[PDB]
Amino acid sequence: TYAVAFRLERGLVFAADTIAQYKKLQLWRQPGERVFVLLSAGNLAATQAVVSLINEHLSQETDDEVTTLFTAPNMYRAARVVGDAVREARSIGFNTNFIFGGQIKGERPRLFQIYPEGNFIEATDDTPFFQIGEHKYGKPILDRVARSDMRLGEAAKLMLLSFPIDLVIYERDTFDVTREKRISADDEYFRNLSNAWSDALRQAFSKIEEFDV
Amino acid sequence: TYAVAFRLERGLVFAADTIAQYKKLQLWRQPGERVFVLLSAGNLAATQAVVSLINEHLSQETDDEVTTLFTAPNMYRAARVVGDAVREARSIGFNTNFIFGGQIKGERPRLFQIYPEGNFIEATDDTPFFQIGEHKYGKPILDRVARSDMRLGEAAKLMLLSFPIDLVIYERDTFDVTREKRISADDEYFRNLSNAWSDALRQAFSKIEEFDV
Ligand code: NA
Ligand code: NA
């Protein structure tokens, strides 16, 4: 499977293609305080194991000094929580990266890519997106076109062209995921967008074939 | 590694990134009679083994009924020769596809994709190109933009944007490979082409973001 996420000035956008715990886009929320999204591209067993470890600590942790998603004071600390779950899930496709993002009150929205051993890197304005899965579809186009000042809707359109897809748009400082949408191949808007993209690409190539190589 | 080839009305274009027998683009020729190009994306040992088997039969075959690249009456028969070498090389990265194309006098230029067991498919006007390697870079762009009536130079430009690269252009009915070029990352023409492509893509996206999804 394939998933992708963008960090913009205005917020975060998450997308993944596709039984709740095995779902490739996972959401956690405390109203007005914190929101988190995990994207997976690994096999079903790997996704479930990581989510189960996160939820085990949210639901049953007795030690107050252990950090969970709901006690993490910032998104770096929250990413370490997921990193620990990703590493520990190896005890429970199996060696794919995860994407984790969200926002905690008092701090900007942040986005991370988590590796098999629980280490991670964070999205920057220079590198505002991550892709995970067997094939990072349309990476060259995202590299050339993605910008951190893009509106959330236009980022979503670019992401959808790189690919049913679960799409989540998170607006900065809202601490809720309201804009949640499932888009199938039979969606007429998405088909219309893809048709226009193909037309625009052919026109784009017709311009640049002026140049020699 | 990555390689790609196009079959056009005007001829064939081959490209591969990169010690002669391990080279990822391999050429055979009989002047004015036949030309062949093999592209590999597998490991070094796999490429050498296939080429060695092809050359063994060209150089040492004593049985006249055994088909070689130089006795094949048509390109389908020549593809079977390579297919046999690809399958037999498994006895000698290891499970990647090959691309094989060329022309024999009395017949149009033809292009094939060879699978690990020696079976193959042929390029058509509807599907005029093949890609091989770990990552089929820029497949969505080739799918949307590639056309069988493209000039050889414009096909080459499109192929180069999907990626030092060894580029071969074969013009129909010539039975020679004269237009052979090695293009590095420091090539100013290729850099200029890539810069313009990025600019054109951003402009292309700016047009199509009119549409909703
Ligand atoms: Na900009
Ligand atoms: Na056309």
Give a quick summary of the entry:
The structure is a homodimer of 213-residue chains. Chain A has 213 residues and is α+β, with helices and mostly antiparallel strands.
Topology summary:
Two copies of one chain form a homodimer.
Chain A: E1 2-8, E2 11-17, E3 25-30, E4 34-40, H1 44-60, H2 75-88, E5 98-104, E6 110-114, E7 120-122, E8 129-133, H3 139-145, H4 152-162, E9 165-171, E10 180-183, H5 188-208
Antiparallel strand pairs in A: 1-2, 1-8, 2-9, 3-4, 4-5, 5-6, 6-7, 9-10
Helix pairs in contact in A: 1-2
The complex binds sodium ion (2 copies).
Describe the structure.
The structure is a homodimer of 213-residue chains. Helix content of chain A is 33%, strand content 27%. In chain A, helix 1 packs across helix 2. In chain A, a hairpin with a 3-residue loop joins strand 3 and strand 4 (34-40). The first copy, chain A, has one domain (1-213). Chain A is built from five helices and ten strands, in the order E-E-E-E-H-H-E-E-E-E-H-H-E-E-H. With 213 residues, chain A is α+β, with helices and mostly antiparallel strands. The termini of chain A are far apart. In chain A, the strands form two sheets. Chain A has a five-stranded antiparallel beta sheet, covered by helices on one side. A five-stranded antiparallel beta sheet of chain A has the order 3-4-5-6-7, with helices on one face. At the A-B interface, helix 3, helix 4 and helix 5 of A face helix 3, helix 4 and helix 5 of B. The site of one sodium ion has 2 residues of chain B, from loops.
